[PDB]
Structures are given as C-alpha cells and as structure tokens.
Amino acid sequence: QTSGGPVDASSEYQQELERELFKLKQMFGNADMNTFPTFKFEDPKFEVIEKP
C-alpha cells in the first residue's frame, strides 16, 4: 500500500538520498543529463606549410 507514498511513509532517508544522488549526477555529468545534448564542435589549427 505504497502508491500514495513513494518510499513507504518515510519523511526521512531523503536527506541522505539528495547527497548521494548529488555525487551521482555531479560526476556522471555536469549539465541537464535528463536532456538530449547539443554539440559545439571545434576544428583543427593550420599554418603556413609551403616553402617560406
């Protein structure tokens, strides 16, 4: 009988879950991981390679 309470009448065990997931998300990524990513790309450098 727990669809009315997600974690079975706790009002506790959350203060630590927020910290643990904090670490979890924090280094799994550092953006809106729920989202799909948009990509900025960079392309190589180049120089004068003919005979100077």
Partner: protein, 54 residues
Amino acid sequence: IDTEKSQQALVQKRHYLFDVQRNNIAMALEVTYRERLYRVYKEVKNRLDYHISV
C-alpha cells in the same frame, strides 16, 4: 657532371615534402572526424546510463 646528375636525382625526389603535407592533413581531419563520432557516442550513452544508474 656527376654532381649535376646527383642534383637532378634529388630534385626528382622533391615531391615527398608535398605529399607528406597531404598525408598529414588527411590524417588530421580523419582523426578529428572519428573523435567527434566518439565524443557524441560516448556522451549520449553517458546520459542514457546515468538514467539507468539513478
């Protein structure tokens, strides 16, 4: 005469500098392309398995 002939041989072999420029450019852009491939691949799999892990 023989010195002239040797100079001729060297200036015949000349084209390696240009084809090496060619090779380096080609390899560099290919490396960049496959690096982009793996960048996006890795990161979308990272989002997916982040969701799975949480």
